[PDB]
Design a protein around this nucleic acid. Structure first.
Lengths: 54, 502
DNA sequence: TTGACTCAACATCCTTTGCTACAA
DNA sequence: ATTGTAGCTGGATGTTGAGTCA
């Protein structure tokens, strides 16, 4: 469950700028402690969410 | 400390964060491939690139079926592919250098420091990508992607192939420095993206790298695209080769490219353990937007044979955590070789003349548990069961070990009419398996489930589901809840719901 | 340049129902 | 006072990197 602001970047970076993943993931994962556990058990969720509004 | 750095290992906290980050990063990469694959299918782009391919060449891409020798058709296919490789070199009028390691594997140190500093976010949108491909302006990645887009616009079954390079979570080094010498030239020696094309006549995928190595090949055991040499693999650790198709498929096509999938590469995937196995399978499933074809069957047949032909590895460390094989010497004390079974191979030990080790297939190894151990899976020993092995163990004690077929499923007695459970000497029911729950009762796990039952004065039994180990010493049982007759469940669930009133 | 070693410091797995001393 | 409570697992095996040597 992310802000609309970050999810914009995540989608933009993932689809057209994956060369810039490293710091954005570093940043976002530091600001979203929960994400850690989310990815671990619900990857398909995070996936479909990234493909949503794509 | 200096000793902390001598042995160049990191903390367990780091191990887990690297492991997670690896996964996170991997997902993003794979999703990137999936989205890029979409862009390739772009109809506006398609009709443009289609024009780059002469009628002659188009005809070679769909050769007429040859009865007497299907090979002659494969030949014609390969020819069209080659000519396509050529006019693409011609079309792509500018190649750029990668800006900073492209999508090649970054080191942990590089990632830690990356956050720290700003960079110029040269934004790429979907349109930009199309315009780039049609003008022939871009780095080697965009190039092959455009090439794929061209082949698809000639109605050939062309895959985008992406070798995902997340950081190595198997890398436990605190210092992750790299050799600066010839660093670029060695990184670009092998591509990250390439192409696979389906040969219907021979029923195999053809491997096509039109941009980097500029070759077309029919991988059998070796691939020219699997990076080789310590130097190169510093930025190109091959472990997730993913294939995306026209119809929005997504297949883990690594097996093709990894000479040593099972020994060498397994060790390097998030897939080494069983949790990661399922985890990855989920990511694939989430990217696979088509139903299975006969082609999927053909490729699986190929992969199946590739596993068969890899065979016993050449080196001891490679037979460490192997999915199919174990060294005689690595058979755990709690294991025996299934009756009438030998080794299935041998291993020439590198370093000592004529030194050889017996190798067993994991499937010929049987796991034994003790009387107690089995009971922790709701299992008791059969009437006429003799044990298979004996071990000395301290609390020195000869503990006997039994095979699965010596064991019987433990069925506990039914609860009485009043719902009276028959319990142990401590006044509880041991419940370590769904099997251990009486067949007319239910397990209700709740911190207050015990309190609730007592309040309703109804007949129950506390559930010992596991044991907690600790304190100065000794063990204490974890009572996680209640076993009660099924017909009292909703009564209990109600009480539980209103505990604050009890 | 190769892996099989041994070393040394961790990590992870298997265990699977308290006991004594003392302050109140 | 004779109860309520604070304070006393772990050993065998597996994994990781360095360093050395044939």
């Amino acid at each position: 469950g992310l802000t609309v602001e970050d999810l914009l970047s995540l989608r933009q970076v993932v689809s057209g700028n994956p060369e810039a993943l490293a710091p954005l993931l570093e940043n976002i994962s530091a600001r979203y402690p929960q994400l850690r556990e989310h990815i671990m058990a619900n990857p398909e969720v995070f996936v479909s969410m990234l493909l949503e509004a794509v | 400390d200096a000793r902390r750095t001598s042995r160049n290992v990191c903390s367990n906290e780091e191990r887990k964060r690297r492991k997670y980050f690896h996964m996170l990063y991997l997902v993003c990469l794979m999703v990137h491939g999936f989205i890029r694959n979409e862009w390739i299918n772009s109809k506006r782009l398609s009709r443009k690139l289609s024009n780059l391919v002469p009628e002659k060449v188009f005809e070679l891409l769909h050769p007429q079926k040859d009865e007497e020798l299907p090979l002659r058709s494969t030949r014609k296919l390969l020819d069209g592919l080659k000519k396509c490789m050529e006019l693409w070199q011609k079309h792509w009028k500018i190649t750029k250098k990668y800006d900073n390691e492209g999508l090649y594997m970054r080191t942990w140190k590089e990632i830690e420091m990356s956050a720290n500093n700003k960079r110029k976010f040269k934004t790429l949108k979907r349109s930009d990508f199309l315009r780039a491909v049609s003008k022939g302006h871009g780095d080697p990645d965009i190039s092959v992607q455009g090439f794929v887009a061209m082949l698809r616009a000639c109605n050939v079954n062309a895959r985008l192939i992406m070798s995902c390079q997340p950081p190595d979570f198997t890398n436990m080094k605190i210092d992750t420095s790299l050799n600066g010498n010839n660093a670029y030239k060695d990184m670009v020696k092998y591509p990250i993206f390439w192409c696979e094309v389906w040969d219907k006549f021979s029923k195999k995928w053809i491997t096509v790298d039109p941009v980097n190595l500029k070759t077309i090949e029919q991988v059998r055991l070796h691939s020219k695209l699997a990076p080789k040499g310590v130097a190169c693999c510093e930025r190109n650790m091959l472990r997730y080769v993913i294939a995306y198709d026209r119809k929005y498929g997504c297949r883990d096509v690594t097996r093709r490219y990894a000479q040593w999938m099972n020994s060498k590469v397994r060790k390097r995937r998030i897939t080494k353990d069983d949790f990661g196995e399922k985890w990855f399978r989920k990511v694939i499933t989430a990217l696979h937007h088509r139903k299975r074809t006969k082609i999927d069957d053909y490729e699986d047949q190929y992969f199946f044979q590739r596993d068969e032909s890899e065979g016993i590895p050449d080196s001891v460390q490679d037979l460490k955590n192997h999915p199919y094989y174990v060294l005689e010497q690595d058979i755990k004390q709690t294991q025996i070789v299934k009756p009438g079974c030998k080794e299935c191979g041998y291993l020439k030990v590198h370093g000592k003349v004529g030194k050889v080790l017996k190798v067993y297939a994991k499937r010929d190894i049987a796991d034994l548990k003790s009387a107690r151990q089995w009971y922790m899976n709701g299992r008791i020993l059969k009437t006429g069961s003799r044990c298979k092995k004996v071990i000395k163990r301290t609390v020195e004690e000869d503990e006997r070990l039994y095979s699965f077929e010596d064991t019987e499923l433990y069925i506990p007695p039914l609860a009485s009419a009043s719902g009276e459970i028959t319990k142990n000497t401590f006044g509880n029911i041991e419940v370590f398996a769904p099997t251990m729950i009486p067949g007319n009762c239910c397990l209700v796990e709740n911190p207050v489930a015990i309190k609730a039952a007592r309040f309703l004065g109804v007949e129950f039994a506390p559930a010992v589901t596991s044991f907690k180990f600790e304190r100065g010493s000794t063990v204490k049982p974890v009572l996680s809840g209640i076993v009660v007759a099924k017909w009292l469940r909703e009564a209990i669930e109600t009480a539980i719901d209103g505990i604050e009133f009890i």
